[PDB]
Symmetry: D3
Subunit: 244 residues, 6 copies
Amino acid sequence: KASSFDDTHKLTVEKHGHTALITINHPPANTWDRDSLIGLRQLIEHLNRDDDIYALVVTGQGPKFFSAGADLNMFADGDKARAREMARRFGEAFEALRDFRGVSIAAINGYAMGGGLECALACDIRIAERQAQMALPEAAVGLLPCAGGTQALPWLVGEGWAKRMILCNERVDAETALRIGLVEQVVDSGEARGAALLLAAKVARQSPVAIRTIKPLIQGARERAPNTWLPEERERFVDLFDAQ
Amino acid sequence: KASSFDDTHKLTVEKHGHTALITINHPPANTWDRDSLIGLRQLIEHLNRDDDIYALVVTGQGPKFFSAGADLNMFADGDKARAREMARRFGEAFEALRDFRGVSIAAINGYAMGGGLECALACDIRIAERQAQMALPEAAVGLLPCAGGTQALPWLVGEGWAKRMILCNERVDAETALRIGLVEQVVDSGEARGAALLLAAKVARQSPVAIRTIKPLIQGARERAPNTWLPEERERFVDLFDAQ
Amino acid sequence: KASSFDDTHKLTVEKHGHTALITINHPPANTWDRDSLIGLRQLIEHLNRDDDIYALVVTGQGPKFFSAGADLNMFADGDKARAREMARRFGEAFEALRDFRGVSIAAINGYAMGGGLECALACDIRIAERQAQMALPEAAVGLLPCAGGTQALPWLVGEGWAKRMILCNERVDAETALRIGLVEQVVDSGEARGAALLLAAKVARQSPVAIRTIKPLIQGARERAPNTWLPEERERFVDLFDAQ
Amino acid sequence: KASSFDDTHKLTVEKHGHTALITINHPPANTWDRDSLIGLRQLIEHLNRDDDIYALVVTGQGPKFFSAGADLNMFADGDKARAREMARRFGEAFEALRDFRGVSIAAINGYAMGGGLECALACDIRIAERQAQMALPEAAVGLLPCAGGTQALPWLVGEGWAKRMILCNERVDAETALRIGLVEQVVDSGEARGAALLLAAKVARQSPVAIRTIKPLIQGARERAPNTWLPEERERFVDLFDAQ
Amino acid sequence: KASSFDDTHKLTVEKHGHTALITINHPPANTWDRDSLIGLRQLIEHLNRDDDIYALVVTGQGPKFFSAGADLNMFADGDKARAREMARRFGEAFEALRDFRGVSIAAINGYAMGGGLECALACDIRIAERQAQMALPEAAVGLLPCAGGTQALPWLVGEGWAKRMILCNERVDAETALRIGLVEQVVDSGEARGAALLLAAKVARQSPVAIRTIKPLIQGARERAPNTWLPEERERFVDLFDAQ
Amino acid sequence: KASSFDDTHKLTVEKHGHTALITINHPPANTWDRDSLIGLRQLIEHLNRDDDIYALVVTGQGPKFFSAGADLNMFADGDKARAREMARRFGEAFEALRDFRGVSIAAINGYAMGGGLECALACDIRIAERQAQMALPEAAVGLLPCAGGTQALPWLVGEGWAKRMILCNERVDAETALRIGLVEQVVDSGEARGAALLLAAKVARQSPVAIRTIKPLIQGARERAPNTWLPEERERFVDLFDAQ
């Protein structure tokens, strides 16, 4: 899928059924840069226009790294202007992945730190390998998680654990992540990608138009309290009842 | 309790102390229909006007089903008009049960799927039997949980598990439900009703006027961020200090 | 730290590195009164103006009590006027502790009930000893948790467990608290203070200006939905990139 | 209307068609006290249960005063406890009048100052006599408009004029009030009551069930942004289409 | 503009510079029906993809009617299903016109009642002819303004005048509309279209990319309080500073 | 007042009673630059710590310009980094002036365009001279009002007139500004400063502690719907009743 456009070779896309497998391919640490952040946004835009795609899996190339976060080549020095543009690209890329019209599954096959973890927080579901370690260590260098980490992390794991990770710089492993809600499924070494593609196959058995309508409803509390969406819930239910 | 009005025989009510035991009695699957959804709303309205009632337990008649959700007799065919009215009745019935002035305890004695699960999400506390299985499989038929499921489920279990259940159609058992926050207590087969009635007895030992005032405060985040309620919290605290 | 001002001897402060150790010293139950609630607010105000302080630990003097909540000497009788002023002092003291510019760690060394538990909910992180028991039993005397308990408790543990504690008056121990998210770390008897001071030392290794900026961002959902803060997140990220 | 219950002789009620004419009768200044604030809330509760009442007019007895605000007999001295209870009674009385299920019309026949003005802000529509003068002069005695004035006044007239009245203690006459949106219609001396009863007669020509449903929708922005109500608008539109 | 697609002859579109002139052409009263509501949404979608279009004017064909609101052919009888679909089409058509990426100007050349008025409320700016009369008389037939009228009308004119129009069924003329904020400019008979096209020409002198970015910011209070957008304001300001 | 610190000679401060008269002194157009935006924030910080100051007037030196907005020396070229810092300084300076603890009065003595108008929108009350002209013409150069103009302007004048000014680049004079709510008082040439200082004297007759408490309440709708502040209103009313 994404068969043709200027897609960076740092992001490989393969079609497996109704599922798009995205692999971060940037050695040695599967780090995110400008080229890949631009390609990610564009790629999500085309997958939202591909009606053959009901699901999405992203994972890191190789067995060691899911993603080590932001390249150092970007928050270089130095340039104040670079930093701002880079924070922009992270938001645009990960908000787009967040707004994927199907379901997105993060197959955490290793270290997911900083921006790599924020990328997985951007996905709908996370599947981590037993040895995987995740953290947001930006405060250690006087910075912060600018790709949504300050909001997404406490959203799943709660404020206590979120500031244990960000404010105290403590990393967590897959089994601790499962205990606190950061991940939904722990699997053995080398089983995330596979596990993710198989969970992405269960989605292709559901009505795609129902998935696309339901998902924004589930994320409703991210912009507005849940009770404010209940009338909208019935309305989209009737919209789904129409057209069988 | 609810000693006299036109209450459908599909909903049996028995008074045990300061507790109203509601039993869904609609074989074979304790399914919800129009008659029972109307009776539920009306029943909650009278229990809110009965000052002898401090608590509430709902459970499914029989050992197999808590509730299998919406009757097929309602989202029949077909009629676009039926579907809309039915989504309305679900909201009105379960929002009323949600707005019960005392505490409500769901004693999940079996399958609670779709609308049956939304009914239990409407209650304050859930107690599940070990063998009980719960899901929201509406997306499998191109529909959605229209009785609050798209908001209530992620509210307790988080977005990851909520779309694991809704978007991926994966069901969960009582022990998984406990791990993710969907239920608060797991008990052995045939022990939910009993467990629920005994938890409903601890409530009758607390000031009822304090329960009625406190409960809306606890649900405050469902309509508005928690910090916006703090001045209101002290105000209702003084209201409780008045009248001893 | 807090080396000089009128600080009540009911609140002892000792400086350990970049960490301020606050100890509730009011026998026999480390109860909160007017004098201590005033001193707490004032103390947090000076710690926010002490740039030598990056973290904060509060704990109860002695091995038995963290804090038994509100003194009876305050919600005395009786005076309607007293009650209101007291609810005010709780809010002001614990909202200030909540708004501490560094990280605050509750070292629960025993019973933390009512206002004592609300004090620990006010802190960023909670570390409980195995034998510690926590509850909000205000509804048992016809009152309510007026120091933020009705909002803070469901915020961490969810609505089900929050009303299990408040509406049903059921207390929880440290291992149950860990299971539900009320605490982040369980430790053995006599190890909380120590554990807390060592977690407070990891914070002094991070940029303080990053901690002060990040923490309000993490608590953003308490006043406004998380998505509304994302542009602000990047903006404060660039503010942190400036000044290296 | 309100034909029988313990209604204080300080509040006279007369039935004119489908309209309830409420007259503040407390010389010399039509001031609000505890007895009248309690009676007002109770009176609105019964008018909401009287299906013969589609509209409501309140005005001051005599030609000189609509209402001079709060009695001095209440924020007496002195008692801290009195003040709090009194602020409570104002809110409860005027929020109830605000939540009247039909339309309420303030016929301002004279001075409406402080609580008298807040009473008229509580009504749906205001009709002022040419000589009428309105202000919120609470800040002049070190207090504030505690019956909703700090929110209702800028809601209609804008922040500039609202703090011109409250923060600068400047009063306005009926013609200035019309220019800024504080009133909707200016009439000649002795014509407000009459004008109000005739506007209240136009309401009795509309579907009452439509008025009761529509009015909360119009006030939707007072609790939540307008766009959040649009799905609810259609839903209540279909509810009105049902039952013809 | 909109040079080619299935556009209903009930909606005529002509290109005048960078401005699209939309004319409701449905005698005798320029009423809105299903065919025209579908065409309106589609038309706005294509104008948002036409980079040659910076502005938009809608007006009624003929000198007598701007729009008399909803056709009777739709809320026919009767069918409950029809009513719901029709409320849906109004929302979708007018929310799209509301979300036009350029500026939209309503040239009110006559009666604009009910849905016709809601259509003009959907536009950015309103220019009314002296003889034009506007109202929302839905409550007179037991219905309500389902195309946003219950939210848009008080948004501009305030609650008092909004329920004077809706709850009391009182219509307003162009000079009263100007006094209350319902319209921004009053012009003489036969001068609205012309006035609107000339105001739409001033827009083509501004940066289009600035108009598209600014307009959502101006409407920010419709979904969220204004202070929550200020960081976003600077961010889009820098986005505009980039690309010159 | 502001008797001693590094205050830029571009901002002259004179003490007249309990009022601080701030005069933008930067020829020829009273334009805002970095030096003056920094000094403004600092100046407001010290006036908030001066208990001798109850009010504030800002106006432009000379008879021709109130303020022509942002210096060209700042959004120079060119530097992307400059633009961002400058948008930051505007927000910080005008949000501080907005958050002045007393009342602030803009005495518009001439042109107030772009940032000059945003400065006056930041004040509580605006008094304009008859010849004064105001606009936000940023969209004409492909930019936007980054100092709050996109939120403050529609907040007072409504969306129609706000986008008439911003999206259509149409300027308004003092008499049009009065008609639409942009200003509260129009005065003759050379009378604004004087008028403002005399309105600032009426404020010094009110309780300062009441002004400081009330003003945030009036601006409550800028961050949260008005109904959410009503319990807080009574609470601060009792806080004002305490301490006489």
